[PDB]
């Protein structure tokens, strides 16, 4: 673990806060410009939609990336969300009310064992087993995001490896000549202190680099900045042009 | 169900090419073509036989998953990128031939001939060399046949494993935005007259695929950006993508 202040810049620059993590798969070396906020413990949001949908998955709640979730017809301050979903829109357009129904069918008893399983953040789903990911007790730290995230990209969680290969298909989020991103934002609203979550990783023809960064969001205007401060950090560290 | 639109010639004409562009509409289950005749001609596939290919050898076990490293020979080539090993996934990108000749000659002749029968591949036949059929042999394709191929891997009803055709739609990943997403291989035939470039595959949109089949001619290697370049203009005109 290595410490580089000189990523403070890109966060001063539009007067905010927060952390980057970077893992090296290669060298198994890994890289922060806050070592103490790399390992603090916050509310997932919407990040938790990567368990969420492979557990989904492999107890048969969700067939497969086709089947269609109608919309139940409350419009909701989210234009995107008012109509029918897959499981690939509704990861896009981070659609709680799908998943919220996906909780409610997977149940307490089932969803609290596979996330002991998974060794999930501090693994505690105290709260509506609807929303603890957004208002319970439920905490994980950039670096669990990313021991978590290498056990998916090596299919190595406690799953088939068919639901793993289903959530990398959801996550794809960018590819072209030089890189692939799979990766899922996040906006913890509900309980202080407001943040933002970008967690993923970057493929390259030799070598995968594993991210995961979190900062505060006192409102929606920054909601940019979780992808455009991550990209400067890769353009930096010469991963992408 | 075919409708003609000639008004994409100019897109060949604006660059002093001639070929076909061909799309599907899934949803409406309906096809559009500049050029009806040349839609149903028939070509060596070159370099798209690696989908096919690619298939077979992952269900046989000949590539075990998209990780497996293929070491260089050590043989000094002509294009750079080959010089090194690969995975299923650069081995794609980089369209190593070397890589997909020793695939197969592991897979064999009748092993071969019984999968191409089994995908309905074109006119299904290997005459030639085991290791370089699909570049100078008697196999040959039409951009019709290319769609109706490509529709079956996307639905998974070709005869291999669900696996197979996951691993293989994952390494034809080629662009991905927040507008759409393209999965694709390209070709370049110079070893038969008419020397070709082709380009196969799909955009996956928030609610429809649309399926593409293109080929030009390719007199030099100068124009083969034109695979990809054309095919757009035709996207963009008929608002697919932005």
Redesign the interface.
Known sequence: WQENKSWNAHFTEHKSQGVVVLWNENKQQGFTNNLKRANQAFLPASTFKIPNSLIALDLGVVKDEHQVFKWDGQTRDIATWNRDHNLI?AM?YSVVPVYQEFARQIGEARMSKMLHAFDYGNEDISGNVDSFWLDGGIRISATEQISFLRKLYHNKLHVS??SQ?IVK?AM?????GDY?IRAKTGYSTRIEPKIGWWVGWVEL??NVWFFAMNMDMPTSDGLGLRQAITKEVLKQEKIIP
């Open positions: 829109t896009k490896e068919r290969r298909q794809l989020t960018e590819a072209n692939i023809d030799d």
